[PDB]
Amino acid sequence: ARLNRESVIDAALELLNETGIDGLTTRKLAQKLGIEQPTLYWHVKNKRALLDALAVEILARHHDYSLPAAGESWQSFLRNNAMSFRRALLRYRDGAKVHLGTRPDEKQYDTVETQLRFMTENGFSLRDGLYAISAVSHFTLGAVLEQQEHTAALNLPPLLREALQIMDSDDGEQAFLHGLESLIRGFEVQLTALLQIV
Amino acid sequence: ARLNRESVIDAALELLNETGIDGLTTRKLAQKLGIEQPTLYWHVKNKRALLDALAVEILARHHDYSLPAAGESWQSFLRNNAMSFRRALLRYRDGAKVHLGTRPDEKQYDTVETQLRFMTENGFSLRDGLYAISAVSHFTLGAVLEQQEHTAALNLPPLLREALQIMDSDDGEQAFLHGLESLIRGFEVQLTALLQIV
Ligand SMILES: CN(C)[C@@H]1C(O)=C(C(N)=O)C(=O)[C@@]2(O)C(O)=C3C(=O)c4c(O)cccc4[C@@](C)(O)[C@H]3C[C@@H]12
Numbered sequence: 001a002r003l004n005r006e007s008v009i010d011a012a013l014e015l016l017n018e019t020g021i022d023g024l025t026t027r028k029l030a031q032k033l034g035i036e037q038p039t040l041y042w043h044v045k046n047k048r049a050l051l052d053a054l055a056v057e058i059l060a061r062h063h064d065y066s067l068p069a070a071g072e073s074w075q076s077f078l079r080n081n082a083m084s085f086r087r088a089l090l091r092y093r094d095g096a097k098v099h100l101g102t103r104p105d106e107k108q109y110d111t112v113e114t115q116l117r118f119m120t121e122n123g124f125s126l127r128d129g130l131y132a133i134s135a136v137s138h139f140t141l142g143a144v145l146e147q148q149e150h151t152a153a154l155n156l157p158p159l160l161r162e163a164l165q166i167m168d169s170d171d172g173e174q175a176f177l178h179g180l181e182s183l184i185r186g187f188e189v190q191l192t193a194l195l196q197i198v
Numbered sequence: 199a200r201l202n203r204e205s206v207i208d209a210a211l212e213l214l215n216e217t218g219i220d221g222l223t224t225r226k227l228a229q230k231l232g233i234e235q236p237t238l239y240w241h242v243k244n245k246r247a248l249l250d251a252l253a254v255e256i257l258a259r260h261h262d263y264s265l266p267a268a269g270e271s272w273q274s275f276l277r278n279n280a281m282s283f284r285r286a287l288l289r290y291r292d293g294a295k296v297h298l299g300t301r302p303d304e305k306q307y308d309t310v311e312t313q314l315r316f317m318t319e320n321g322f323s324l325r326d327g328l329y330a331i332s333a334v335s336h337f338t339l340g341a342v343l344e345q346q347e348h349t350a351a352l353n354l355p356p357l358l359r360e361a362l363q364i365m366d367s368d369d370g371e372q373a374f375l376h377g378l379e380s381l382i383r384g385f386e387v388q389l390t391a392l393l394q395i396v
């Protein structure tokens with residue numbers, strides 16, 4: 001196998017799709033590349049080093065709306081960005097468990113700094129723009145995770161019966177797209193009121 | 199050790215606190231109870247059977263505001279309920295990874311049916327009350343998970359520096375409590391407008 005960073009991430013996403021994250025061992029990655037474990041360890045010191053790099057890499061390969069277009073509102077950027085993120089995260093089995101607990105990589109600094117400067121520049125203070133970006137990030141994570149884990153880890157009172165039917169009727173994209181509009185409108189109400197009691 | 203359902207869940211939460219979920223093996227549970235694996239298997243057929251039961255059990259032991267008080271608004275019930283849920287989930291290491299992908303247990307049917315009937319009874323249709331309850335559930339899950347995984351998996355442009363400082367300054371309860379008010383206000387705006395374009 002060729003063994004630079006790029007060929008290791010590829011084999012490691014490929015493997016994450018067959019085994020998920022808890023089956024993603026440096027031993028199955030060595031066996032997948034057809035090499036021996038001291039070879040692998042020359043390159044990949046460990047699983048955290050690896051999970052972190054994969055976190056960076058799924059976004060960089062599949063998360064396109066990371067930057068606001070010229071003339072775009074903060075509400076359209078937060079919508080277009082969340083959807084794009086939900087979808088980078090669903091491209092790979094356990095894509096959202098991989099992201100959990102990370103923090104921006106140095107390779108992403110210019111992108112996420114632009115994002116926080118665009119919010120201040122639209123009237124958010126740093127703390128509130130930060131909180132808006134986090135609630136969007138945390139709601140897309142918990143939504144994709146409840147979807148990915150339910151698919152995989154496979155007498156009703158009348159309403160629960162009907163709700164389960166609705167829940168299951170699609171991938172959870174409708175429930176997501178609708179909670180995203182409520183999140184975005186609640187932030188508008190906050191932004192606009194500020195010192196007026198609301 | 200005594201080996202009924204109740205003593206198994208106890209030993210299994212105890213063990214989840216030392217090892218987390220990926221260290222929660224039926225072998226370390228057998229060793230923790232001081233018994234042999236065929237003994238254990240008479241009781242606990244497997245890890246899913248076990249994770250599912252723990253999911254039920256943390257809520258039943260630590261999630262108190264599962265039911266609306268008499269005369270409470272749907273906005274105060276959604277607030278009081280989300281906070282209570284965030285906290286059942288944080289009581290145990292990897293408490294929120296345990297919950298992921300589950301669905302209500304038969305032992306919870308009366309509680310979650312009441313919850314969906316209270317929303318319809320406050321003007322939500324079943325589909326929208328469902329979506330409101332889910333967005334609250336998915337935002338508390340992704341928030342607790344990003345917190346629990348970051349604590350555990352342990353050149354800045356100016357704004358990111360300051361945001362990281364803010365992010366870390368508390369457990370993430372302030373960011374959570376604030377995204378929860380934006381979620382709840384966006385649903386009010388939806389509820390009230392209905393057929394009026396909004
Ligand atoms: C909201 N949207 C999905 C985000 C985004 O699209 C990012 C991106 N690279 O495109 C993030 O990395 C993004 O997805 C993301 O994960 C972000 C973060 O994790 C954090 C953390 O943990 C702490 C401080 C600041 C941030 C952040 C502002 O960079 C976050 C931006 C998140």
Ligand SMILES: CN(C)[C@@H]1C(O)=C(C(N)=O)C(=O)[C@@]2(O)C(O)=C3C(=O)c4c(O)cccc4[C@@](C)(O)[C@H]3C[C@@H]12
Nearest residue numbers: 163164167264283300301302306309310331334335
């Ligand atoms: C929003 N609040 C945190 C909830 C709640 O407090 C529950 C509870 N037992 O107290 C749930 O089980 C609750 O936490 C929860 O997990 C619920 C569900 O998972 C679902 C699922 O997956 C599908 C259909 C219906 C539901 C639900 C209506 O029962 C959910 C209610 C969630």
Ligand SMILES: [Mg+2]
Nearest residue numbers: 102103104137
């Ligand atoms: Mg992140």
Ligand SMILES: [Mg+2]
Nearest residue numbers: 300301302335
């Ligand atoms: Mg649930």
